[PDB]
Amino acid sequence: PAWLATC
Amino acid sequence: PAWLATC
Amino acid sequence: PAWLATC
Amino acid sequence: TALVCDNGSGLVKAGFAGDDAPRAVFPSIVGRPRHQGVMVGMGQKDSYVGDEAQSKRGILTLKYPIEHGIITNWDDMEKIWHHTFYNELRVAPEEHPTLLTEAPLNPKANREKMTQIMFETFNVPAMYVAIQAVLSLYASGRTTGIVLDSGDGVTHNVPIYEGYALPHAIMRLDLAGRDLTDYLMKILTERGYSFVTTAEREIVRDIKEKLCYVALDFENEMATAASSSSLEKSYELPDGQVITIGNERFRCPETLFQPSFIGMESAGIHETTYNSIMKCDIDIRKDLYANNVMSGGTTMYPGIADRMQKEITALAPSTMKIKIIAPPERKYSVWIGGSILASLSTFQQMWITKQEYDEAGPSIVHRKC
Amino acid sequence: TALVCDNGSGLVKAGFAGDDAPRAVFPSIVGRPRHQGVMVGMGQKDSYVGDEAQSKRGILTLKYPIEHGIITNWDDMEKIWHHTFYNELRVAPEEHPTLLTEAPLNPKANREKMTQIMFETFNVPAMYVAIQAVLSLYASGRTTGIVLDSGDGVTHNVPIYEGYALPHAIMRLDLAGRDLTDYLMKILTERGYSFVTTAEREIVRDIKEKLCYVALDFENEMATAASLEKSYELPDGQVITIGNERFRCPETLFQPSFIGMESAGIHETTYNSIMKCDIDIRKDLYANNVMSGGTTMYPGIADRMQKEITALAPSTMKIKIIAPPERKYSVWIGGSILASLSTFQQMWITKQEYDEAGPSIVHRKC
Amino acid sequence: TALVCDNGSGLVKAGFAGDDAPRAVFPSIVGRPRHQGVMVGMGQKDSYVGDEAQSKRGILTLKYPIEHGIITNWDDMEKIWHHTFYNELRVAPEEHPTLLTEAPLNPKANREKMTQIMFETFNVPAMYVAIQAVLSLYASGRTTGIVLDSGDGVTHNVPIYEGYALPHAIMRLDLAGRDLTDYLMKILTERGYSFVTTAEREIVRDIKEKLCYVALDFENEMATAASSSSLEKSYELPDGQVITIGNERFRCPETLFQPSFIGMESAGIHETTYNSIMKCDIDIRKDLYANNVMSGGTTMYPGIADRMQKEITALAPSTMKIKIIAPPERKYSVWIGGSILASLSTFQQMWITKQEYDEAGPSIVHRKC
Amino acid sequence: TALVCDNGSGLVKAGFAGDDAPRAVFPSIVGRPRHQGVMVGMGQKDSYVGDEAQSKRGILTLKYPIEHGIITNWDDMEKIWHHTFYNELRVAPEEHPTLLTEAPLNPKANREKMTQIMFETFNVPAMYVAIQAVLSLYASGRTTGIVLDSGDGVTHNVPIYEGYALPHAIMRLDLAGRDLTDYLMKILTERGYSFVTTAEREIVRDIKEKLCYVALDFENEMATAASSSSLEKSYELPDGQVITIGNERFRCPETLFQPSFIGMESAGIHETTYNSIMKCDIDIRKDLYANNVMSGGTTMYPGIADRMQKEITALAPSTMKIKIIAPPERKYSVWIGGSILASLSTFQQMWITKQEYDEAGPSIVHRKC
Amino acid sequence: TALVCDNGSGLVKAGFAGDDAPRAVFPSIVGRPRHQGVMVGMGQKDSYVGDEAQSKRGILTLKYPIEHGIITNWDDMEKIWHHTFYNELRVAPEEHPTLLTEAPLNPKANREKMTQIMFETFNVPAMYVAIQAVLSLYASGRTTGIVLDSGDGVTHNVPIYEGYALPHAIMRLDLAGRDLTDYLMKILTERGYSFVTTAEREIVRDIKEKLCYVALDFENEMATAASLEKSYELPDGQVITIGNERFRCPETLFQPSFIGMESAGIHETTYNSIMKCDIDIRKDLYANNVMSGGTTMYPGIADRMQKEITALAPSTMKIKIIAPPERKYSVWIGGSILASLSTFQQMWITKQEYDEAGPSIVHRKC
Ligand SMILES: Nc1ncnc2c1ncn2[C@@H]1O[C@H](COP(=O)(O)OP(=O)(O)O)[C@@H](O)[C@H]1O
Ligand SMILES: Nc1ncnc2c1ncn2[C@@H]1O[C@H](COP(=O)(O)OP(=O)(O)O)[C@@H](O)[C@H]1O
Ligand SMILES: Nc1ncnc2c1ncn2[C@@H]1O[C@H](COP(=O)(O)OP(=O)(O)O)[C@@H](O)[C@H]1O
Ligand SMILES: Nc1ncnc2c1ncn2[C@@H]1O[C@H](COP(=O)(O)OP(=O)(O)O)[C@@H](O)[C@H]1O
Ligand SMILES: Nc1ncnc2c1ncn2[C@@H]1O[C@H](COP(=O)(O)OP(=O)(O)O)[C@@H](O)[C@H]1O
Ligand SMILES: [Mg+2]
Ligand SMILES: [Mg+2]
Ligand SMILES: [Mg+2]
Ligand SMILES: [Mg+2]
Ligand SMILES: [Mg+2]
């Protein structure tokens, strides 16, 4: 979620 | 009573 | 409401 | 032959395993009389239950035993199961397995007490309690999709990829078709119509499920209907009066996509599906975006099935197509899935038996199902 | 065998249970002599109760013991009950259960004193007191409808849906036949005839009972009447002619403002009685309007009430004014029904309960 | 200088913004003479309004324009506003603002037509319609509390935590002193006294206002009064006859805590305050339990605050303290709060001016109030 | 005098260098009001930030600007930095140098935008951003150990032999106390207690902080609690209710040692520490096994400090000595190490000054740290 | 007809001898389901091997059975061999002779257990385990060269003059594409992309295969990039942009200090393996530099070696880096060449030889 790509 | 419909 | 605790 | 009961919080849908339509459809209410009965030799027994307690609506106190999926009053839910097995189906439950149902993320006392009542007060030979949103995939036949169930108390997404469900990504929202009725009966007041009691909740629900539709652009529709346009709908009350609800016809199910109307902090059903997809893995997401299965009675509006496809595409990636599967016999889909699942030769070893029950107690549904 | 005594306020309609017409029908007046007798070797006892007072009417003063449903004089209501038991039905009441009656929304001293008299004076084994409109719905066989009772003191609506009465919506109005008799003998004075005393009231009542009729369109009849006359023969060879005052006398039922009553007519204490019921109940309470009592026997009302409730009820709802032709004794027919059911034998007020709790058990039961 | 007219449904309490007590306290009744006057001098008039209709009570037909908070008759409510502005306050409304009032959950036609009459007939410079249970909190000076208001019609319940009112938990009931008078004059007939007319409602109301009291334990008081005790109170009529009601003085206000006497399906005013608290958040409940403001006329019974505390302590958790506040000047509390709220320098930008009304008509009140 | 702040995703710990305890401990939440405020004449600012937003949390919509160590929103993070400098510390930032922190393996945009906001908005003379796991070794005083820092979003394993970090052997895991609070409020629903909103997430965190312990033998504890035993613990909600949780006391911090409960594929903290040790050299391992430092808030359970020593000795060589260095003041250990490192004469030339910043822009943070 | 399989640490390449390209390649992956299967029709097979495990990445926990050439888990390797025979070629192993392979300087337990499994489970009539780097020279046709094999686990140089492989001048370096992918998914963390799981390592490998290229002048490229940007689309619809981190990933092959290795690059271990030979051999070993494997398929790997070995070579020496375009399956091509020889026909290991002295016959016959 918080990143950019994954999670 | 005295509403527009019910009561 | 209708649970056990909250709601 | 097995029995497929679907205990909803507002509609009991029962029948036999192997059919294609539920044989017993009647609401889940138990009516108590609240008035002085002065006759004699009269058939006013004690308490009416089901569709019998909708004819004598003006005298009765209509109580729903199930609320938000969980069961609150266990004495009259026993009455509803007794009425369903005898007066509406006419079958002895000592000769039939029974396939029950439950919303996910429920309290664990419901499974145990439902098993204890079905095994000790009804003496079924076998029983099994499933999860609602799994069965809507059995009904569609596919085994890949994210099932959006709704209808009278519970609204929950369960993603399933290839027969493997992801329980770390299931969501559950308590915003289904009871809060829409209680919001419609409160937004009706500002026009002039004051429906208050439990007998008038049925009239508000009968308004809701045949006039209310879901808008596409809510801010465009609230400016269109603000002009004197062709949106009003006269509805004939059971005493004779007509009521013209023009503007509060799409404001009732726009609560489903903006839950701040009742003061809930949550996001709408278009965003507990996107988050429930984004909690799944990257290989799973591509053909979870393309299989959105709707279910339940609340998803039977003239709108939503092409409004979810507009709201999810606003926050999905651009090169990922969406297909909201609306199989328009979807109101009984959680029963069609139970009729399919109970009629399989692969399934018959999954039944909780009586000999398992007397050696494990009602704590065996936590390790089964 | 039980006793069904519809102890009304204009006449006493008593009889035996299980039948379909009362044995005793006679007015409830206790006439007393007012002049001085001179013939020594005669009768002339002390007082004449019933139709004997109508026979010796000119020498008498006729007192009504019941006024607007409540019993005002207990010393001769005991006389009327004694007369109806012995001299008219000829039964010792120590071997018979009795079924009394009462208008709704009454003072609760009546329910106590009637029970106290029926147990401590006549020694009834077991009694019960009903309501005049539940029995009127028992008579028609239904269990669904709204009743409208009338006759010398009370006019009340008791709506029942399925045996479940709605006791927060029982309108009571005191505008029955005695207040029409007293308006007829007041509106006849403009023509010239002056009826004053109690015998003249008993003549004006007989004028009302056969020459008066309810109009349909009141202003149309008041315009037609200025162009319809009748002729009643007084009991000494004399004729009067009432032309206009035969629909103005029962028009007070639909317009109570003629005697200064603030309340609305009987077409608006039925609509307002339905409009306090619930929206499921109104759909058939519109379509089941039972009628009972004496003052609904005009050649009018049963077509005028439909005409003036159809202008108040919503236009998509049909209205059936159920007017049985044998409706004058409908409360008694319902009482003979209600005392002939095997479900009812555990509903009486036995002598043991009266010895245990006293006459305060009548509000507890019934 | 602004004007504060708490236009109630049973009493019109108007005055000047800045004081602490209303100048004009008089009921809202318009009397039409039902009799025939024969005196060729002056002798009579056409329609008396206010306390003239209570002075000439015998020959008149007393008619309340407002029923249950909603205005039903706009012709004589204009007469009552005209009477209050001229004959009782002696001002010109073209040089004064006006702070009106309204119960929560009303039809929008009240808010529209009240603005239209105040601007197009009396020609006020500015106006603003408040809501009653906010102004009781303004009068008490708090910002945290759940306000119970009553008096001749509506009985509503508005919870406010820090100024942020929670409008999804505002219960509204119609069980106030009008419906208590119509039950007292129906339970008096059991004793023998038959009060019928509209002039004789103003005597049963005067019986209620000084003999009726709220019990503590209702089933204990109904067993105490079964013996002849000190509950009897002799009240005399306008003519010299006396009546003695012993038992029916804690059964008229018992309809508040038990609405099943009048056939209402609702629960009592303690339960629609416990439910109004339980629809709030867990942080808010702790200091809404300890701040219970009572307002309105029908809360001036003797034992009402102790009965409310006893019947909320059985519903709240035992480790949470309750404090039913009740000032002695709670009858005019809405007017005191109106005089406070109109006398703020913060508020002078919150008026609906004439210039806003000229450009969008009487529809700015929904977006401005 | 220099400033040492510890920007975590949970609490913000700040103060002056040279001390031994932070002056300012308050959570990193910014709350927005979601209800309509009608108490005109009050103080109702549009954004509450800090422990005051935890005080008035029943109205607010609480939101953490940091998720999993990285900053999602810079608008209400500048609010928290402004509140920390001004309201809670009462110092202008134009005089003092600042010392921030960062989790390892974070994106470069965090360092760049943090430098840009600290220099071009608060105008500090000098700044420096360290790594959150070196400072625990600095506070412990050792130059040898493998630091396990874990609180609210991240979990590191940074080995340092003698002042030489091994960047090919650091392990980052996103499994700290935020996911434990979410799993606790998802597993409480099985018993009956249903916590949904952010205002109830803040209650479930307070349940977790004072009732959850880490088990030693998980199967034996799950077999013990299956019998009716003394593992139950009652907790009182802020409105008055009591909740009893018997089994989910160790099931909430068992996700740290079995991350397959929340659906994570990774290995537990006992195995990532072992893999971080085995990624080092053989001469380094002999005294990396002996010095196992812990830090952060999630290492403050009554369990883990003697379950880690069991689970690493289960898979270490038998002749190797393991000693988990768990000081009791380890919650503020990162700030203690920051206050030590900022009060050094050797560190005084390691600052990123204002002159060298604008000569190279905000990209100097990648080479100077 | 003989069988030639190339059990690499990456993808298993198998097929029939005497052919030119392998029959079917697929990755050496055995995945297990890690979620709860709630269905009854399907959700089966309990473990997926090879290509279906790469198809269902989301459910499965993929796990390679070979790490740096050695075989850690023997159970799933039996699954992979059984799949590669049966489901991929549909041949009984009892009929055909099988040609295996092995990286040099492996533990001898690999050869022993490989022989034991290939005889006592598949009943192969004749096996032979070869060495990977000689098969590249057999595919190239020469007998002169130094083979820079580089697959997924291992990377090793074997110099061969004309036959007579020098076993003292052979290096081995564990720095291959798996260690490049584990560094790429750690260098992608700077831009903001976090790949954690095995199913995301299977995406980072796909990013490395088609966007990473070997730079020529590393400092000049690092100064230039501060437009080298490319865009890859993740399989859920999301795009990523990696400009700088596509020549830094294969730069670890020439600077092993990035991932913390003491060793030297492939341009330097090749030079040390050349200089460990005699003096006369270098004049042709410099001129013949064979490369193989999949990790030598970057855009510019051959040019970088040709540039950087000449920086540390004598100036009068010429270097030709033999980079065939079909070098990804060159070890299998050499196996298919070498298995179709009448000279090699006598070089097998029969079942009768294995029945004597157990599985240690490959320690003398290989
Ligand atoms: N045609 C309809 N249109 C919109 N809503 C409907 C319609 N029919 C039923 N509903 C709503 O769905 C609810 C019942 O549907 P259902 O999904 O079967 O509930 P449950 O799962 O509890 O059995 C009703 O309460 C009603 O609010
Ligand atoms: N055919 C009639 N037409 C008009 N009025 C009648 C008629 N018959 C009876 N009445 C009136 O009704 C009164 C008696 O009716 P009844 O219902 O028996 O009164 P109660 O029930 O109190 O005994 C009479 O006094 C008379 O005024
Ligand atoms: N001292 C009192 N005791 C009991 N009831 C009262 C008392 N005073 C007024 N009431 C009742 O309250 C009603 C008026 O109260 P009020 O609050 O002024 O109504 P509103 O809010 O509409 O103006 C009256 O009709 C009466 O029934
Ligand atoms: N007494 C406690 N026991 C266990 N966990 C705690 C305790 N106190 C706080 N925590 C957890 O640690 C987190 C905050 O601790 P902290 O190390 O300061 O995080 P950060 O470094 O990001 O600021 C909280 O979210 C909480 O889940
Ligand atoms: N076209 C390519 N470009 C760059 N690297 C590749 C390419 N193809 C494969 N690789 C890398 O080499 C490995 C597989 O190649 P291969 O030599 O066949 O392995 P093995 O020798 O174990 O069979 C993969 O892990 C991948 O990282
Ligand atoms: Mg359902
Ligand atoms: Mg009668
Ligand atoms: Mg008021
Ligand atoms: Mg920290
Ligand atoms: Mg290879």
Numbering used by the authors:
A (entry chain Y), B (entry chain X), C (entry chain Z): 1 to 7
D (entry chain C), F (entry chain D), G (entry chain B): 6 to 374
E (entry chain E): 6 to 232, 236 to 374
H (entry chain A): 6 to 231, 235 to 374
Passage from the reporting paper:
The cytoskeleton protein actin can flux between globular (G‐actin) and filamentous (F‐actin) form, and this polymerization cycle is coupled to various cellular functions. The structure of actin is subdivided into four subdomains, SD 1–4, and contains a central pocket for ATP and magnesium ion. The presence and absence of γ‐phosphate at the nucleotide‐binding pocket induces conformational changes that leads to opening and closing of DNase‐binding loop (D‐loop), respectively (Kudryashov & Reisler, 2013; Merino et al, 2018; Chou & Pollard, 2019).
The available phalloidin structures are in complex with actomyosin or actin/filamin, where both myosin and filamin binding overlaps with the D‐loop (Iwamoto et al, 2018; Mentes et al, 2018). Therefore, we determined 3.8 and 3.6 Å structures of F‐actin–ADP (called apo, as this has only ADP bound) and phalloidin bound using cryoEM and helical reconstruction, respectively. John Wiley & Sons, LtdThe cyclic heptapeptide, phalloidin adopts a wedge like conformation, and the binding pocket is buried in between three actin monomers. However, a closer inspection of the binding site reveals that the nearest residue I287 and R290 from the third actin monomer (n + 2nd monomer) is approximately 5 Å away from phalloidin. Superimposition of residues within the vicinity of phalloidin also does not show any major side‐chain deviations between apo and phalloidin‐bound structures.
